[PDB]
Design a protein around this ligand. Structure first.
Ligand SMILES: Cc1ccccc1C[C@H](CO)Nc1ncnc2[nH]ccc12
Length: 167
């Protein structure tokens, strides 16, 4: 039993809700919140910009030190950093950005990072400003993640379509 509330159950391990991931994180304080990161950990817009803003830019300061030490992530890769005031940890995961020409096949690799954590709050990877079809992102999620994932989806019109079209 966990404190996630109001989710629809898609599968044995995947749950989905129309919600602002920032507001959800502040309520649940999950062990792991997933960020929709880029390889530079430059948290400008979308989920990343919103999470970082909610940390008063502390996420960005920490991320800049991470990059200065380790260099960029890989597309499909991830790193674990602090969750600041939002969660214990933030798993920064880089899905492919279709608007940068990156290989959508990398989306499965991106979701595989979730399997290293027993429970996560997360957005749909590569959706939104990363340019991929969110229906496809949900499918890859369900077919790749085996741990317990609570998906937030901020956009209301997007949520209803994802539920109604789910196979
Ligand atoms: C995946 C992605 C990345 C970048 C931009 C937009 C999206 C699409 C999703 C679904 O709507 N966005 C969000 N999902 C949950 N919590 C959110 N909080 C603020 C935005 C937001």
């Amino acid at each position: 039993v966990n404190s996630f509330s109001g989710y629809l159950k898609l599968t044995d391990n995947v749950y989905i809700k129309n919600a602002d991931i920032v507001e959800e994180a502040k309520k649940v304080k999950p062990t792991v919140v997933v960020n929709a990161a880029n390889v530079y950990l430059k948290h400008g817009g979308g989920v990343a910009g919103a999470l970082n803003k909610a940390t008063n830019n502390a996420m960005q300061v920490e991320s800049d030190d991470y990059i200065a030490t380790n260099g960029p992530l890989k597309v499909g890769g991830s790193c674990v950093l602090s969750g600041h005031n939002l969660a214990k940890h933030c798993l920064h995961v880089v899905g492919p950005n279709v608007n940068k020409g990156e290989d959508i096949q990398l989306l499965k690799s991106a979701y595989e990072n979730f399997n290293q954590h027993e429970v996560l709050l997360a957005p749909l990877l590569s959706a939104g400003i990363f340019g991929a079809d969110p229906i496809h992102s949900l499918r890859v999620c369900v077919d790749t993640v085996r741990t317990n994932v609570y998906l937030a989806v901020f956009d209301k019109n997007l949520y209803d379509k994802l539920v109604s079209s789910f196979l």
